[PDB]
Structure 1
């Protein structure tokens, strides 16, 4: 949600399809929603998380 290595906290904001979960279906503040996305993006590049569920 603020860090990328924390693959545990991020797996909460990711549907069973890889894509990140919207902010409206989590309440999560806007300011936070943005920061959270970045963690998931850079994390995907470090192969710590999947881009999608297919590969």
Structure 2
């Protein structure tokens, strides 16, 4: 039950923070493709986006850090 297949997105955006936030943990970790049911191709992209965000301090690497 993938979101990105239905939406039909060409590429996942690191700037689209809200969207990312659904796929990240309360502890900051990226959520598995088993749980979200994201398609494999998209999942990787999502992960990459998240990573990018983390570099730009848009998303946090973890809950504890400060």
The TM-score normalised by the length of structure 1 is 0.95
The TM-score normalised by the length of structure 2 is 0.80
Q: Distance in 2 between matches of 1:44 and 1:35?
A: 14
Q: Distance in 2 between matches of 1:13 and 1:53?
A: 15
Aligned residues: CA RMSD = 1.1
Q: State the 1:35 CA deviation.
A: 0.4
Q: Which runs of 5+ in 2 are unaligned?
A: 1-10
Greater Rg by CA:
2
- Deviating above 2 A after TM superposition, structure 1's stretches of 4 or more consecutive aligned residues are none
Q: Distance in 2 between matches of 1:18 and 1:45?
A: 13
Q: What do the CA deviations read for 1:1-55 (whole angstroms, capped 9, x no partner)?
A: 7000111000000110001000000110000000000000010000000000112
The count of residues paired between Structure 1 and Structure 2 equals: 55
